[PDB]
């Protein structure tokens, strides 16, 4: 796999780690739809809305399996630690019109 998952379930926005690279989910979009990070960085998405959201990477992107992240309620967060360079497209499972990518270099 090209990322590790610190927590399989969401956690409170207040618990975001030092040095995490935050992507807000606000106004029904990933507010940073193209994020550039380095190997070893942890990206944390934070849902700021009442509607739940996740991040979903199809098979072959983060690794062999799809990664269907857990649904984040309002003011919850979810992280991925990227361990290899690449370009990692994702969408929101219930809202597939909501798309983003993480470029790891
Ligand atoms: Cu969504």
Swiss-Prot record:
One annotated GO molecular function: copper ion binding
Query: What residues does the Plastocyanin-like domain cover?
Result: 1-105
Cofactor note as given? Binds 1 copper ion per subunit.
A Gene Ontology cellular component where this protein is annotated is:
periplasmic space
Cofactor(s) listed in the protein's UniProt record: Cu cation
On whether Electron transport is a keyword of this UniProt record, the answer is: yes
**Which positions does UniProt annotate for Cu cation binding?**
53, 92, 95, 98
Q: Where in the cell is it found?
A: Periplasm
Q: Which UniProt keywords apply?
A: Copper, Electron transport, Metal-binding, Periplasm, Signal, Transport
Biological or metabolic pathway of the protein = One-carbon metabolism; methylamine degradation
- Major localization class: periplasm
Q: What does this protein do?
A: Primary acceptor of electrons from methylamine dehydrogenase. Passes those electrons on either a soluble cytochrome c or to pseudoazurin.
Q: What is this protein called?
A: Amicyanin
Shown portion of the complete protein runs from 27 to 131 of 131
């Amino acid at each position: 796999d090209k990322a590790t998952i610190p927590s399989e379930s969401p956690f409170a926005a207040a618990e975001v780690a030092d040095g995490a690279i935050v992507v807000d989910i606000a106004k029904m979009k990933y507010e940073t739809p193209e994020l550039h990070v380095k190997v070893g960085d942890t990206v944390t998405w934070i849902n700021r809305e009442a509607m739940p959201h996740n991040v979903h990477f199809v098979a072959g992107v983060l690794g062999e399996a799809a990664l269907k992240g857990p649904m984040m309620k309002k003011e919850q967060a979810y992280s991925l630690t990227f361990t290899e360079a690449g370009t990692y497209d994702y969408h929101c499972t219930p809202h597939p019109f909501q798309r983003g990518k993480v470029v790891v270099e």
